[PDB]
Design a protein around this ligand. Structure first.
Ligand code: HEM
Ligand code: CTE
Length: 344
């Protein structure tokens, strides 16, 4: 039914199935060490598989990203106990920079490494804490990530589709159905994840680390390239500084394609800006214009069905949240309102 998801999931699975450092049984031991707060043990465990003499030259993106995933869980772990991994692990930083080069991504772990590039089986899944809530946390992202990537593709395609065309409404309705997975993610999180366990036990593992003379943020669903999708959809031309800064902050953490998608659309008006300009020039008595705008409004409706419940979720945990959440929600409502005013 959401048939575009399959190829994305299949590329994720290629990385999930890769164990080039033969680290599976070793990374499974990390949660026990984190529970004991055993920093020397954690370093000693990494040094058991960490390449000291470089990366095998037969490797490609898949193996390098898999290697970054396995070393990566030790990065957030060591920082969680108060230590810069690059300061406490000999030869680690060069390795991290080599993997950042091989994958064209930061020299640490990201959301991608800890979720969709991370195998799902109990005898294989990598984790910081080994907690049920962490298992649930990773799954919440696996629900929607492949659908999100498909949604980005659909958004780029929709950009060049004229509102006068019946394709616009059809494409808009299809983009909605993919973004509905974002809502499924939140419903799943609110049902299965303890806010208190997240804040007290999970969140301490996602702090920044210093590599190469700069700071790199830890894994978060904030790194999901939804912001790129909405760059193209509504936000590219926005003059909100805080929002611009927010997008530029997480940009390095997404796949290179989406960094390129983002670059391509910064110089153009957003989809919403073109669609509304077209609607005012043609008229709303054109049925394809009416259906186009109606379906586009439902796209904004589903984004809000993710974003509003997600704010409550974050505030519930931080009751045990960064204000940008509220600001982004307000912006999205304004965009939806513009689409509504196009029909009222
Ligand atoms: C208890 C669970 C969760 C908490 C406490 C939480 C909290 C937060 C916080 C505090 C931010 C602000 C950015 C920052 O970290 O500084 C944020 C942003 C974000 N989060 Fe979550 N989150 C949770 C679950 C999820 C889930 C399940 C998803 C989707 C799978 C998700 C997707 C996003 C996205 C896409 C953003 C960027 C802002 C936006 O699009 O509105 N989060 N979240
Ligand atoms: N969405 C929030 C909560 C979060 C932290 N790490 C996460 C992971 Cl690893 C998966 C899903 C959500 C989160 C964030 O990006 O910080």
């Amino acid at each position: 039914t959401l048939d575009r998801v399959g190829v994305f999931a299949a590329t994720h699975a290629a990385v999930a199935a890769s164990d080039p450092l033969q680290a599976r049984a070793l990374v499974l031991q990390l949660p026990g060490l984190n529970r004991n707060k055993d920093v020397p043990g954690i370093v000693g465990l990494l040094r058991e598989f960490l390449p000291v003499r470089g990366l095998p030259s037969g490797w490609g993106f898949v193996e390098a990203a898999a290697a970054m995933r396995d070393i990566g869980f030790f990065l957030g772990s060591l920082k969680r106990h108060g230590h810069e991994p690059a300061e406490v692990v000999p030869g680690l930083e060069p390795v991290l920079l080599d993997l950042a080069r091989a994958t064209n991504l930061p020299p640490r772990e990201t959301l991608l490494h800890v979720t969709v590039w991370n195998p799902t089986a109990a005898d294989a899944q990598r984790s910081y804490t080994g907690l049920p809530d962490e298992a649930h946390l990773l799954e919440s992202v696996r629900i929607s990530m492949a659908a999100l990537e498909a949604a980005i593709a659909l958004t780029v395609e929709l950009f060049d589709v004229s509102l006068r065309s019946p394709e616009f409404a059809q494409r808009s309705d299809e983009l909605e159905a993919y973004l509905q997975k974002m809502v499924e993610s939140i419903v799943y999180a609110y049902r299965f994840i303890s806010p208190q366990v997240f804040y007290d036990e999970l969140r301490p593992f996602y702090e920044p680390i210093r590599v190469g003379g700069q700071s790199y943020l830890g894994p978060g669903a904030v790194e999901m390239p939804l912001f790129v999708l909405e760059h193209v959809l509504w936000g590219s031309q926005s003059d909100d500084q805080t929002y611009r800064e927010f997008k530029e902050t997480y940009l390095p953490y997404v796949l290179p394609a989406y960094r390129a998608v983002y670059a391509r659309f910064s110089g153009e008006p957003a989809l919403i800006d073109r669609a509304l300009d077209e609607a005012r020039a043609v008229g709303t008595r054109d049925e394809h214009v009416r259906a186009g705008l109606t379906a586009l409004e439902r796209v904004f409706k589903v984004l809000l069905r993710f974003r509003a419940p997600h704010l409550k979720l974050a505030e519930r945990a931080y009751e045990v949240a960064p204000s940008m959440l509220g600001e982004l929600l307000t912006l999205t409502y304004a965009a939806r309102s513009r689409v509504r005013a196009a029909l009222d």
